[PDB]
Amino acid sequence: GAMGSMERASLIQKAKLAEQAERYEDMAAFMKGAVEKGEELSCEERNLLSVAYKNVVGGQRAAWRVLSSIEQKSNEEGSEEKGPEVREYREKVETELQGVCDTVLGLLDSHLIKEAGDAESRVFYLKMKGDYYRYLAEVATGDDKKRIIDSARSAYQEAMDISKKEMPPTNPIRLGLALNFSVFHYEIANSPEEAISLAKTTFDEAMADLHTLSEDSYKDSTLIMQLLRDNLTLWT
């Protein structure tokens, strides 16, 4: 890899600089390099990894949606034929997006997840695995779409099982996992009732645990509870 000659600590330092400069492709390449050093990631380092790739794939998802909308418009009735270009360029962006998802899933599989023993790391990485299979599922149309969806579901489910056994209901990782799994149910699995039930139950159980928290943890947890409520307002 191109980062093989740089010190792990320097890769982490430059990932943080790239974040400040809003250079998220650089940030992701630095954190990929850090992961490939082979040592486990600290909590702060895990969040750098997630932020970097989330911003990269988020730009690609936004672009793919714009191009997909145009492509569907061009396939309507009375729409003038304009050649293969829209499909070609949507396919180009889609392939780049799938490449980023495969890269993240490859890092989790080699070898972040198998080395993660603590609940906070293991749940974090399994949520990530579910997330990036979900982004693959958003663009999937072929014979393996069902298998991609089930890989997202399976990763989210293992993360949920661990989070419910090992973490309090206000834990931000647990909350963010349930938020995203709920959107998986609504958007990918065509199960809006499961999505609503998960979001409501997650919100209610966190509400009842807030009294145990410090002011700073209370702010951390209520921020994500508000996102659960935002989705519930969207959906009901």
């Binding site: 997630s50 932020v51 989330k54 911003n55 988020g58 730009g59 949606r65 997330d131 963010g176 938020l179 995203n180 959107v183 609504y186 958007e187 994500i224 996102l227 935002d230 989705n231 969207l234």
Partner: peptide, 9 residues
Amino acid sequence: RLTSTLPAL
């Protein structure tokens, strides 16, 4: 796209 997931951009 109006649904909220984490991390956010």
